[PDB]
Amino acid sequence: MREIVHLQAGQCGNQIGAKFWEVISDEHGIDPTGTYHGDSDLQLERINVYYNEATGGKYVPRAVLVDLEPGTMDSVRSGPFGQIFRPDNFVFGQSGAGNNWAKGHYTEGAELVDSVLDVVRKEAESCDCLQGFQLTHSLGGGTGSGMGTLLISKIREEYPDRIMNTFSVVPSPKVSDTVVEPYNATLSVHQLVENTDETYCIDNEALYDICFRTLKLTTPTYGDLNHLVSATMSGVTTCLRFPGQLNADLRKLAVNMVPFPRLHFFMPGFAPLTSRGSQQYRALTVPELTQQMFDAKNMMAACDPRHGRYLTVAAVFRGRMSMKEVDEQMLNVQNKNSSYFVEWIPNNVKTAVCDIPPRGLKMSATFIGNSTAIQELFKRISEQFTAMFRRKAFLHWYTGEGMDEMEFTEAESNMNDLVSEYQQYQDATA
Amino acid sequence: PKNQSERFAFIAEWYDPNASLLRRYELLFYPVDGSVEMHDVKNRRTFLKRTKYEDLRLEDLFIGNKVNVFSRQLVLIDYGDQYTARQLGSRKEKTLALIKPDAVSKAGEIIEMINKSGFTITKLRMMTLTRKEAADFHVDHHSRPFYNELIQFITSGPVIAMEILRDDAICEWKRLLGPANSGLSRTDAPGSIRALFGTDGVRNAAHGPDTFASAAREMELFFPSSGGCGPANTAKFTNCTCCIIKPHAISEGMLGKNLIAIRDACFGMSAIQMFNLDRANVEEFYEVYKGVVSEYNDMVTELCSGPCVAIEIQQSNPTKTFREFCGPADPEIARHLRPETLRAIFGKTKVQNAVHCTDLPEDGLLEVQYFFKILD
Amino acid sequence: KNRKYNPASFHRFNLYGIPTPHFNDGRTMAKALHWLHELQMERGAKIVSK
Amino acid sequence: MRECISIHVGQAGVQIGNACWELYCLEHGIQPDGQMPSDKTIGGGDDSFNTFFSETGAGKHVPRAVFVDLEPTVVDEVRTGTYRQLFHPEQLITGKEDAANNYARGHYTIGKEIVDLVLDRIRKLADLCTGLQGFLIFHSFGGGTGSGFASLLMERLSVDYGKKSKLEFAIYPAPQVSTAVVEPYNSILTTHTTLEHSDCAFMVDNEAIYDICRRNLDIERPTYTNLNRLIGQIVSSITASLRFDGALNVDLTEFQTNLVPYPRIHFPLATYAPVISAEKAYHEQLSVAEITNACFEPANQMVKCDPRHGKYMACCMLYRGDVVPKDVNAAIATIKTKRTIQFVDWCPTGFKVGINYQPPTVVPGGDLAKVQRAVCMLSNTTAIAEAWARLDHKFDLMYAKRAFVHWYVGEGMEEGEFSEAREDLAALEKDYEEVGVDSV
Amino acid sequence: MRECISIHVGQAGVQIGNACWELYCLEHGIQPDGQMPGGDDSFNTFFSETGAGKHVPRAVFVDLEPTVVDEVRTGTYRQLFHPEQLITGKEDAANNYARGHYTIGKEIVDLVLDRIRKLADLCTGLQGFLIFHSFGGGTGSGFASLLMERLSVDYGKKSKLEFAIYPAPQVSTAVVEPYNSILTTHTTLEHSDCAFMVDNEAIYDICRRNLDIERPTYTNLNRLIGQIVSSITASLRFDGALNVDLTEFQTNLVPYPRIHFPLATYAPVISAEKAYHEQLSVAEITNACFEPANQMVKCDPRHGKYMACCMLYRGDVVPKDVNAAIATIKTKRTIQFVDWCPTGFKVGINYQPPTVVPGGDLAKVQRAVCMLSNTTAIAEAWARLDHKFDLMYAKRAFVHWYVGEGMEEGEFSEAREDLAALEKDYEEVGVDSV
Ligand SMILES: Nc1nc2c(ncn2[C@@H]2O[C@H](COP(=O)(O)OP(=O)(O)OP(=O)(O)O)[C@@H](O)[C@H]2O)c(=O)[nH]1
Ligand SMILES: Nc1nc2c(ncn2[C@@H]2O[C@H](COP(=O)(O)OP(=O)(O)OP(=O)(O)O)[C@@H](O)[C@H]2O)c(=O)[nH]1
Ligand SMILES: Nc1nc2c(ncn2[C@@H]2O[C@H](COP(=O)(O)OP(=O)(O)O)[C@@H](O)[C@H]2O)c(=O)[nH]1
Ligand SMILES: [Mg+2]
Ligand SMILES: [Mg+2]
């Protein structure tokens, strides 16, 4: 019916994907061993979206972890829920791409793609009807940012009708850890805009601020980013695995999030982020929820929405409420904030409500929106990409791998093509 | 970390029910930070990272223990190396602690005195030894005088049987006993078991093992490693309810204190034995509690997390409702309204109530039977 | 040089730096996402005025 | 699985290998015999030792290092040393007669005798290893063996394994102090070798080490052992990501692609922090921002140069120990918010961050205190041009009189190659000038 | 949080730092090792905690002759301070501002600037640089002058409090000192927010007349200097009813940019024998604050008019008795205020009483007070100094040392003109518009 496979590429995708399979498995009460150890019946009804039944009641994740370096597998195999995975889903090579997009996309990737494609073919056939595909990768690496786009490129040709979604991690100029990071990004975004139904841009730096200010953790680690995205990752799919007062799924959003096929980039949000001190003075209500979604100290992207007008807004709410105010505050936030929403689309907001709360919490919500703020994140990329390219800097590996100079000129044209018509969609009259 | 300092290791065993094969693993512990590791043996991989496991402590590192590591009930079967044997377990030893039938009422005080002296109880059961089993104990006394008197006293009451593990346990457990003649013991020092409650040399409280060779003989007589339990349980399945002293209360050394608070309440203690049941037996017992309470698996986890003691509470006194003596399930509401309940005197977090007791009156015999007929 | 510091305080093997206890995996923010009111009710029931 | 082979050449290479393999055996827990401690043969699921050692039938682990020299003494002291049984007696390769500071001697006459033996031994070690990552070649530009034999060995190694990565650690003649006077000739002549047949070079001068250990370590009278411990610490910081696990694992290919802008520019500068004795770390609290500043102090560089006179093209950070990515981002933001540190117009992002869990160890009887956090810095900057400028000056003042040329000629080397190598080095300098040119 | 760095220069600076830091560790409870056995992080203004819990001060002793700093290295607090806080130069200026400002200082300028850089990087939100020197010593003049010149552009806004020993009008332990004192004044004019000119002679008179000590030493005066700086900084160090930061008293003590020269006073300075039978109260100590025989600068404020007053009580003091005292002080014809300040007073309240070092001179007294008086009665000492400098300079004696060092000769005349203009400005302030 509605089944999702969880592709997993690169070191950034692996840790996020691994910590994700942690998060849901408590929501379904599945042990490290892998048997059913929940309480309620609803906690075990729709595991078939992410889990495949095995003999004796064992449940296995539906995921394929891919990396050019086998060390990240060893980092994944041996964690808390490390061994739950399929012993043959790990497909890996002996040399890494070294953050080099071309080596992952062309040189070394061409040999590992076939072994990955058979495994996903087996898992695609294993379930009767697939709703979509799911894959996490950073845009500043070489394995996930590289071969992963090749994996998406092939798989659309195989399965065109299904949903392809990715949680791409976008590099931030303020804190950057790769000298060739924009080069990999500008080569990757062109792969994305051609082939993806939806995309969420996640920036580490926005999580760095959220950890520092909203939650006020003294020493956050890289588990903070992974856990916060994983909870967001589970929120967008709760209305699938679980019944709600108002139902939705990925395609329900997908039809309603994408006004034109080129615009599929979104900013994620999660409402109940409060520091341990702040818990003492807070009566759990929905008015402060919508307050906590819409203040943009909550965005996980690095683009302020006050600069860019909101096109389409969606907020999926998790927990048992009534809705007369979630329609009122819907209407309330739209009317008085007139200037920040597009005019040719009134009733800019779309909602989903799922009756089942998260573990450890009463109310929860996940916010996704399409806005003109994201155009600031692309035109900043051209600001450093052009700096390296005008001097042909750091070129000799990509040139030495066998491709030409044209591929960079085409990517920037399409990158500039996107923002120019995006700028047009900012400046249009109703 | 730095892969340095104390890094002791044991040999783990896990019964994988799906594969239906016993698998042996490399168990690793780092006492400096309390962290845990585990690696595959045959596949030459790493089973489990260096993550801390506060649920696993240095007190749990010994052979024949059922620890719970990431929901894997692990039995440690062998010292993983030489250097773990030299530091952790060179001189810790296991010795029998029988309590003769005179002092069975004083058990809850003596078990407290056992816990204060650092001993750790591993096997626990009350027994009724036959005459032939009694003669097997006193084989060393067959030539020696008063053989019949020594036999006649010992098979005249429900003998208590314990096994205590500690460093230098054989010497300390004999030292805690004091002189065998109870009259001599009071003159020597009242701070012994045979002096506080003992009356005469024949009716001293305990007659623990003396040497290693003597110890190994008697330990198999009571607690057979072969599984052929010799002395039958003293469990009269009549007008009774069962009480489980939960593992969290065991580790904090309240085992004797809970036993004291039952005996003075004029409740008959017909039967008491320790069972280190696994999760599957926990699910069968708590099968009725599945679904009604919103924390079934948390309630499941605590019983199999450590050692628990099941007690058959005989129904007596003009007021017999042991159900109310335990009191409200949450200790906090117990503390707020009815502090005289055990779940307020020995209260803790909501799950960590002092004991578990039967709720429906009909389920008393069934839960007694499941714990003292099939599991026994 | 031998500065001849206090014998019972200075040495070479003692670690001299600021301990910042930070834990890489999901525990801290897992308990942070665990709202405390659910933690208090899992601890037990609470009581207010008539 | 990652393995990297050490190819130490000359006395510098041999002593560096002594210090480095001592550090590695201490890091992994191997006694001088070459075993596990028997009573605590814990080991387990981690074969982090695999990148430097290899098992045998007897449960013993041999380093993947070849020490090659043309004079017996330097290796004979190892064969009589405490690590005599650590190494295989055929791994230690010696010549009857050395080159004696003569490039033509170590490159055309004496080296060719043992070329085949060295090639066979590296072939055997590569056969033992399964997935090879690279060669670590250690030498100096001064000594005749350490220049000529390294040159020819790498010349044949390139055609043997064109694609395997080749990291080159070498000791530059210092600007003022020197142990040789014929050395600039050899240093000029090996420029072609280190330019055409390498992927990354890590030139170090002794005099900066002198300055640093007398500045911070308070050793008024240090020695080559004190240099070698520091250099081995650099190598350990580079290879610890391969050895153990980390939050942001970075391999040799990763730092390669993030240090080298152009095929002719593969000369980054190494930097370590904190290099401090225990007395000084007592009162200073060390943290990530301040150690990062220590990485960018020009008086803490291994090279006698001022990077403020030039512009950075790339920087690689290797943080190790108890480190947090949040203070990492705070430190990099603080560094970027400065004007003294310049960056070229074509690297507004100019860093490659690696993060590692375990802190470095220290050896007993060393100079470095044990601290919870450390950092290595690899800066590809254009300020290194002046070192080869002074080298060209010095070479030219020799070459106007053809001093010491008769030795090379009698050895049998055609004289024009001196001028040819000068033209190549001059072209390299002009390429660095083009790098420094910014299109504003 | 709040923090001040101490930058003692010269022998006077290093000895003042010795006394002040002894008093600080005894005040907070620091053992000589540096380890702790109102306010919680009250040490955080002067200490940067290690990972072990030890506490390191925030000071850099700077000197151009190691013999002194060397006694500190051989002192008990070798376990307290850190050696690269203790910076020494090979050859001293030898009472030569020329040598201290142009020749020998430039060798160590970069090193000391880097050490202040690292300490200010340890500092998060900085409050103050407190610096100490003398107007007689060559190093304490020249090196301090160039250091302040650099610090002006390296910390534009940061408050840089300046404490200096002035040449006493009668007793002079140097003969070349008026030249250095004339020259140094340009730096304390153009590069300081507040300066604390104090001569030794008045301190000697006060400690003789009140403390009954017939034979004092530099330790005796230095303890009082440490007490003064302790009283100044205790409002920042611990909570008070009315806290007083540095910015407040700078705001409220300097009328014009050219005018930043207050006079310090502290009361009571009394031995225990004299203090048993004396009941002390706020009115008495306030009256003692204004007696001209207890002023630590050899001038009579009755010869001038006050423009500003900074009262700093400490101990068991109450705002109503403060207001009573301020009423009695304002109701007096002898004390004269300028016509353009009818309100001229700052009161700081502080909870804890001043501590007493063992082997000191001051008795443990439940209440004490400090005075920062900005009056026009201070130009007369510079008038004496200019007369001495003129009777020097009419002969061009000792000029040859500075000239052979290599400073231009007309800077002497330029500095004399600057001092003359400063005194004329103070006369303009003293003029009343009635
Ligand atoms: N860092 C460091 N450099 C060394 C050491 N030993 C020698 N060198 C350098 O090596 C250069 C000379 O080469 P050597 O390694 O001594 O000898 P070689 O490489 O065998 O060359 P030949 O002696 O001519 O055979 C000198 O200029 C030194 O700078 C050492 O222990 N540490
Ligand atoms: N009150 C007081 N004054 C001091 C002290 N030490 C030095 N002085 C004064 O400082 C002046 C001379 O300067 P010094 O401190 O001795 O040394 P300097 O300032 O570095 O100048 P040079 O001697 O040239 O190096 C003398 O006139 C003293 O009055 C002290 O401990 N207490
Ligand atoms: N959110 C998140 N990001 C990560 C994690 N680990 C690494 N990253 C990011 O991934 C980037 C490095 O990607 P890389 O490993 O080169 O990607 P690959 O080439 O596909 O393997 C870094 O800039 C990190 O910010 C993680 O656990 N969580
Ligand atoms: Mg040699
Ligand atoms: Mg002096």
Interchain proximity A223–C27, CB inside 8 Å: yes
DSSP string, A240-288: HHS--SB---HHHHHHHH-SSTT--EEEEEES----TTTTTS----HHH
Q: Are residues A354 and A397 in the same domain?
A: no
Q: Which of A58, A79, A80 sits opposite B18 (nearest CB)?
A: A58
Q: Are residues A284 and A397 in the same domain?
A: no
C-alpha A373/C-alpha E371 separation (Å) is 59
Q: Whose CA is closest to E370, among E263, E293, E292, E275?
A: E263
Strands D165-172 and D200-201: parallel
C-alpha A234/C-alpha A366 separation (Å) is 9
Structure tokens at A181: 């990071």
Q: CB A356: neighbour CB atoms within 10 A?
A: 19
Q: Is there a contact between D184 and D394 (Cβ–Cβ < 8 Å)? A: yes
Amino acid at C8: A
Query: Treating both helix axes as pointing N-terminal to C-terminal, what angle do D325-336 and D288-296 enclose, rounded to 10 degrees?
Result: 40
Q: CB A307: neighbour CB atoms within 10 A?
A: 13
Do chains D and B meet with 3 or more Cβ pairs nearer than 8 Å?
yes
Amino acid at D434: E
C-alpha A229/C-alpha A222 separation (Å) is 11
> Under DSSP, is residue A122 helix (H, G, I), strand (E, B) or coil?
helix
CATH number at residue A43: 3.40.50.1440
Q: Whose CA is closest to B161, among B211, B97, B85?
A: B97
CA-nearest residue for atom 13, ligand 3, is A141
Which chain D residues touch E83 with a CB distance below 8 Å? 279-280
Q: Are residues A51 and A155 in the same domain?
A: yes
Structure tokens at D53: 């050692």
Residue B370 Cα distances to B130, B271, B290, B376, D99, angstroms: 25, 13, 17, 8, 88
Structure tokens at D335: 């560094």
Q: Whose CA is closest to E378, among E133, E110, E188, E124?
A: E188
C-alpha D373/C-alpha D93 separation (Å) is 38
Q: Whose CA is closest to A180, among A7, A361, A381, A370?
A: A381
Interface test with C, best of E79, E80, E85, E86 (most C CBs within 10 A): E79
Could you tell me how many residues make up chain A? 430
**If you ran DSSP here, which 8-state letter would residue D308 be given?**
G
Q: Is there a contact between E313 and E241 (Cβ–Cβ < 8 Å)? A: no
Structure tokens at B348: 């803790």
CA B100 from centre of chain: 18
CA-nearest residue for atom 7, ligand 3, is A12
- D14 CB-near residues (< 8 Å, 6+ apart): D8, D67, D69, D74, D75, D78
Which chain B residues touch A78 with a CB distance below 8 Å? 45-49
- A273 CB-near residues (< 8 Å, 6+ apart): A210, A214, A215, A228, A292, A298
Q: Are residues A296 and A246 in the same domain?
A: no
Q: Is there a contact between A401 and A109 (Cβ–Cβ < 8 Å)? A: no
C-alpha A102/C-alpha A399 separation (Å) is 9
Q: Which of B1, B40, B86 sits opposite D357 (nearest CB)?
A: B1
CA dihedral D345, D349, D350, D352 (to 10 degrees): -170
Q: Which residue is associated with the tokens 């301040």?
A: D290
| Phi/psi of residue B91, nearest 5 degrees | -120, 5
Amino acid at A366: T
Three-state SS across A34-88? CCECCCCCHHHCCHHHCEEECHHHCEEECEEEEECCCHHHHHHHCCCCCCCCCCC
Could you tell me how many residues make up chain C? 50
Three-state SS across E244-301? CCHHHHHHCCCCCCCCCCCEEEEECCCCHHHHHCCCCCHHHHHHHHCCHHHCCCCCCH
Burial class (CB in 10 A: 0-12, 13-18, 19+), A400: exposed
Strands B35-39 and B21-30: antiparallel
C-alpha D114/C-alpha D96 separation (Å) is 10
Interface test with B, best of A78, A84, A88, A356 (most B CBs within 10 A): A78
Structure tokens at E139: 């190093």
Q: CB B87: neighbour CB atoms within 10 A?
A: 11
Query: Treating both helix axes as pointing N-terminal to C-terminal, what angle do D10-28 and D72-79 enclose, rounded to 10 degrees?
Result: 20
Burial class (CB in 10 A: 0-12, 13-18, 19+), E116: buried
- Tell me the CA–centroid distance for residue E137 and ligand 2, in Å: 5
Peptide-bond breaks in chain B following residues (C–N over 2.5 A): none
Structure tokens at E351: 């909870």
Is residue A81 one of the residues assigned to a domain?
yes
Q: Whose CA is closest to D69, among D93, D103, D99, D105?
A: D93
How many domains in chain A?
3
Using a CB cutoff of 8 Å and minimum separation of 24, what contacts does D196-199 make?
D197/D154, D197/D155, D197/D157, D197/D158, D197/D166, D198/D154, D198/D166, D198/D168, D198/D266, D199/D165, D199/D166, D199/D167, D199/D256, D199/D260, D199/D266
| Phi/psi of residue B161, nearest 5 degrees | -130, 125
Q: Which residue is associated with the tokens 């003398």?
A: E134
Q: Are residues A298 and A387 in the same domain?
A: no
Burial class (CB in 10 A: 0-12, 13-18, 19+), D141: buried
Structure tokens at A400: 């030495």
Which chain B residues touch C45 with a CB distance below 8 Å? 330, 332-333
Is residue A323 one of the residues assigned to a domain?
yes
Q: Whose CA is closest to D136, among D218, D211, D198?
A: D198
Amino acid at B252: E
Q: Are residues A240 and A353 in the same domain?
A: no
E17 Cβ below 6 A of ligand 2: no
Q: Which residues pair with D169 in a beta bridge?
A: D138
Strands B240-245 and B308-314: antiparallel
C-alpha C26/C-alpha C24 separation (Å) is 7
Point out the domain boundary residue: A211, A241, A257.
A257
Q: Catalytic pick from D155, D207, D254, D417? A: D254
Q: Are residues A117 and A246 in the same domain?
A: yes
How would you classify residue B321: left for phi > 0, otherwise alpha for psi between -120 and 50, otherwise beta? Answer: beta
| N-to-C CA span, chain E | 47
CB environment D239-252: b (16+ within 10 A), e (fewer): bbbbbbbbbbbbbb
- Ligand 1 test: best mutation among D7, D8, D9, D11, most atoms within 8 Å of CB? D11
Amino acid at A377: L
E142 Cβ below 6 A of ligand 2: no
Q: Whose CA is closest to B202, among B153, B157, B162, B158?
A: B153
Three-state SS across chain E? CCCEEECCEHHHHHHHHHHHHHHHHHHHCCCCCCECCCCCCHHHHCCEECCCCEEECCECEECCCCHHHHHHHCCHHHHCCCHHHEECCCCCCCCCHHHHHHHCHHHCHHHHHHHHHHHHHHCCCCCEEEEEEECCCHHHHHHHHHHHHHHHHHCCCCEEEEEEEECCCCCCCCCCHHHHHHHHHHHHHHCCCEECCEEHHHHHHHHHHCCCCCCCCHHHHHHHHHHHHHHHHHHHHCCCCCCCCHHHHHHCCCCCCCCCCCEEEEECCCCHHHHHCCCCCHHHHHHHHCCHHHCCCCCCHHHCCEEEEEEEEEECCCHHHHHHHHHHHHCCCCCCECCCCCCCEEEECCCCCCCCCCCCCCCCCCEEEEEEEEECCCHHHHHHHHHHHHHHHCCCCCHHHHHHHCCCCCHHHHHHHHHHHHHHHHHHHHCCCC
Q: Are residues A123 and A86 in the same domain?
A: yes
Q: Are residues A83 and A95 in the same domain?
A: yes
Residue A299 Cα distances to A367, B239, D365, angstroms: 9, 65, 53
Do chains E and B meet with 3 or more Cβ pairs nearer than 8 Å?
no
- Tell me the CA–centroid distance for residue D91 and ligand 4, in Å: 18
Bond from prior residue into E268 cis (ω within 30 degrees of 0): yes
Count Cα neighbours of E307 within 13 Å in the Cβ-side half-sphere.
23
Q: Whose CA is closest to A1, among A96, A166, A127?
A: A127
Q: Whose CA is closest to E46, among E126, E155, E138, E134?
A: E126
C-alpha A406/C-alpha D295 separation (Å) is 39
CA dihedral D411, D413, D414, D420 (to 10 degrees): -140
C-alpha B130/C-alpha A183 separation (Å) is 86
Give the CA angle between residues E150, E153, E154 to the nearest 5°. 80
Is residue A123 one of the residues assigned to a domain?
yes
DSSP string, B90-153: SSEEEEEEEE-GGGGGGHHHHHHHHHHTT-EEEEEEEE---HHHHHHHGGGGSSSS-HHHHHHH
- Strand ranges, E, within D76-127: 92-94
Q: Whose CA is closest to A252, among A363, A163, A128, A364?
A: A163
C-alpha A387/C-alpha A380 separation (Å) is 11
Is residue A430 one of the residues assigned to a domain?
no
Is residue A127 one of the residues assigned to a domain?
yes
Q: Are residues A353 and A391 in the same domain?
A: no
Which chain A residues touch D251 with a CB distance below 8 Å? 69, 96, 98
Q: Are residues A225 and A281 in the same domain?
A: no
Structure tokens at A81: 């829920």
Q: Which domain holds residue A344?
A: 265-374
How would you classify residue B80: left for phi > 0, otherwise alpha for psi between -120 and 50, otherwise beta? Answer: alpha
CB environment B116-139: b (16+ within 10 A), e (fewer): eeebbbbbbbbbebeeebbbebbe
Q: Which residues pair with B7 in a beta bridge?
A: none
Q: Is there a contact between A276 and C32 (Cβ–Cβ < 8 Å)? A: yes
C-alpha A183/C-alpha A398 separation (Å) is 10
| Phi/psi of residue D165, nearest 5 degrees | -75, 150
C-alpha B199/C-alpha A421 separation (Å) is 101
> Under DSSP, is residue B321 helix (H, G, I), strand (E, B) or coil?
coil
Amino acid at E208: R
Point out the domain boundary residue: A337, A353, A374.
A374
Q: Whose CA is closest to A413, among A382, A384, A374?
A: A382
Strands D134-140 and D165-172: parallel
Using a CB cutoff of 8 Å and minimum separation of 24, what contacts does E35-43 make?
E35/C9, E38/E238, E38/E239, E38/E351, E38/E352, E39/E237, E39/E238, E39/E239, E41/E1, E42/E237, E42/E238
Count Cα neighbours of D343 within 13 Å in the Cβ-side half-sphere.
19
Structure tokens at A238: 């709760």
D380 Cβ below 6 A of ligand 1: no
> Under DSSP, is residue B226 helix (H, G, I), strand (E, B) or coil?
coil
Structure tokens at D310: 């030039």
The atom of ligand 3 lying closest to the CA of A69 is 21
> Under DSSP, is residue A295 helix (H, G, I), strand (E, B) or coil?
coil
Q: Catalytic pick from B39, B138, B207, B248? A: B207
CATH number at residue A420: 1.10.287.600
Strands A163-169 and A198-200: parallel
Point out the domain boundary residue: A209, A228, A257.
A257
Residue E3 Cα distances to C2, E191, E237, angstroms: 33, 21, 9
| N-to-C CA span, chain C | 74
Is residue A80 one of the residues assigned to a domain?
yes
DSSP string, B332-344: HHHHHH-TTSHHH
DSSP string, D346-399: T-SS-EEEEEESSPPP--TT-SPPP-SEEEEEEEEEGGGHHHHHHHHHHHHHHH
Strands A51-53 and D92-94: unpaired
C-alpha A299/C-alpha A303 separation (Å) is 8
Residue B330 to chain C, least CA–CA distance (Å):
6
Bond from prior residue into D274 cis (ω within 30 degrees of 0): yes
> Under DSSP, is residue A28 helix (H, G, I), strand (E, B) or coil?
coil
CA-nearest residue for atom 17, ligand 3, is A141
Count Cα neighbours of B36 within 13 Å in the Cβ-side half-sphere.
23
Could you tell me how many residues make up chain E? 434
Amino acid at B95: T
Q: Are residues A221 and A309 in the same domain?
A: no
Is residue A302 one of the residues assigned to a domain?
yes
- E425 CB-near residues (< 8 Å, 6+ apart): E256, E258, E259
C-alpha E293/C-alpha E205 separation (Å) is 8
- E23 CB-near residues (< 8 Å, 6+ apart): E223, E226, E227, E230, E355, E357
The arrangement of strands across the sheet holding D269-273 comes to: D269-273, D373-381, D312-321, D351-356
Q: Is D11 annotated in some ligand binding site?
A: yes
CB environment E247-283: b (16+ within 10 A), e (fewer): eebeebbbeeeebbbbbbbbbbbbeeeeeeeeebebe
Q: Whose CA is closest to E249, among E303, E177, E196?
A: E196
Q: E248 an active-site residue?
A: yes
C-alpha A36/C-alpha A29 separation (Å) is 6
Structure tokens at E127: 């409050």
Q: Whose CA is closest to E198, among E111, E266, E263?
A: E263
Q: Is there a contact between E26 and E357 (Cβ–Cβ < 8 Å)? A: yes
Q: Which residues pair with D201 in a beta bridge?
A: D168
Residue A137 Cα distances to A32, A142, A159, A160, A201, angstroms: 25, 10, 20, 21, 11
For chain C, what is the radius of gyration of the CA atoms? Answer: 23
C-alpha B205/C-alpha B181 separation (Å) is 10
Strands B9-16 and A349-354: unpaired
> Under DSSP, is residue A406 helix (H, G, I), strand (E, B) or coil?
helix
